[model samples]
Target: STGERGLHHLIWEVVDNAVDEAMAGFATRVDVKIHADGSVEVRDDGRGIPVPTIDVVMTQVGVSVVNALSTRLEATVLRDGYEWFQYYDRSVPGKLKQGGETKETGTTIRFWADPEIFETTDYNFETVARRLQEMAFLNKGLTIELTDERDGKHRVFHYPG
Candidate 1:
């Protein structure tokens, strides 16, 4: 189901992972960006993917589906005193290359929806922002930032639980 709504669900799949970390009290912020190049990026200051993080969220088959539907994907993980990088092209996995060391710990995944798979790659900022605002209310104190680089529209959703 790579329909318009399904394409959006691709995004929700990744956001849900970040939200889960917040719900489990491991994450405090989730950043989402709609790039002008028609790619979407989600970042979370949670435990790295190596820590049952990806496994826990993969319970929903989240990243798997996202990877399958995306033409290209890049995942950066900062943890264990090292930064790691992974890339996927057409769902083909790439080795996790260790980058420079970093005191920070988080995960960032950016992907471009496969034009062959998606009927429409267009993402609406208001639609995404509204859902993120709702998620913020649900997770209270979790700051979710939605940015649209196409038009420079940005919104930060934060609620005091």
Candidate 2:
């Protein structure tokens, strides 16, 4: 189907979440990894998207939607000394398991896009890297890293402050 031009849109949608966090000031660094298991992992050193925000009952449901669009989605969040992990199988969410305490504060989102929905399962690293680079270039003081495990190489994009 070649996506007919919209094929790669979801990739941007999820990445946009991370980018939005950075633009909102919770993000400082990001790690994008192409895993051996045919998954993509995005990690950020920002405030973890919370389950509860006090005044508001928050749900990390956007992640579930991302999972429903994918084969699986797993998230690990470290926030305010608490650490927890959750899994979603193409929108079927599992229980939230408490991992433990964490000194780091951030969120890790890993998902595998459903090959059934896309024209091609393969992703273009250079395309993604360029976008990340543009983000880094446009906004100084942030770090973005992209790694392709198969290639065993990585490129880091950052704004030198």
Candidate 3:
């Protein structure tokens, strides 16, 4: 069944990206949001999501896979003095949808998992948080915040400062 397992994998992918940024010594903040509307978002104050190149990038494919697995996916990036945004019904293998500039220099990814592919849309905060906690423990300085906005609950986990 692709219920919690599917959602779990998807969530991990997003977290992994954040961890990657943190491991690279860029991001000091990683926030995971479990939306009330079946959408999961990962926001990080990292180097930001890169724009598509002439060849290809996994950041491109990552959001695409999330999009492909999800009914709707939106990727927003703020960097080098510009806010770049785009949305995809599925994943975009080439370019991105038209978007607008807004604010900040971070990467925010919001994706709604497709009901057809997943048995359930809900996620386990403990399971997710546990993994993040372990990451913090392993990294020793990485700070992560897990918020279940569905109920206004939040907990920030990290290693010794």
Q: Which predicted model would earn the best lDDT?
A: 1
Which tens-of-lDDT digit does each residue in 114-152 have in candidate 3? Answer: 888987677887888888888788767777888897888
- Residues 43-81 of candidate 2: C-alpha lDDT, one tens digit per residue: 888888674254421245443346666888787888878
Error of 1 at 9 (Å): 0.4
- After superposing candidate 2 on the true structure, give the runs of residues whose Cα lies further than 4 Å from its correct spot: 1-7, 52-65
Better of 1 and 3 by lDDT: 1
In order, candidate lDDTs are: 0.84, 0.74, 0.76
Q: In order, what is each prediction's RMSD in angstroms?
A: 2.9, 3.0, 2.9
Per-residue C-alpha lDDT of model 1 across residues 1-161, encoded as one tens digit per residue: 87888889878988998898899998899999999887899999998777255455322333488888888888888889998887887877676698898998888989899888887899988779878988899998999999899988999999997
Q: What stretches of model 1 exceed 4 Å from their correct place?
A: 51-63
TM-score of each candidate?
0.91, 0.85, 0.85
**Candidate 1 pairs with clashing backbones:** none
**Largest TM-score belongs to which candidate?**
1
Per-residue error (Å), model 1, residue 94: 1.6
Clashing pairs in 3: none
Residue 109, candidate 2: alpha-carbon lDDT: 83
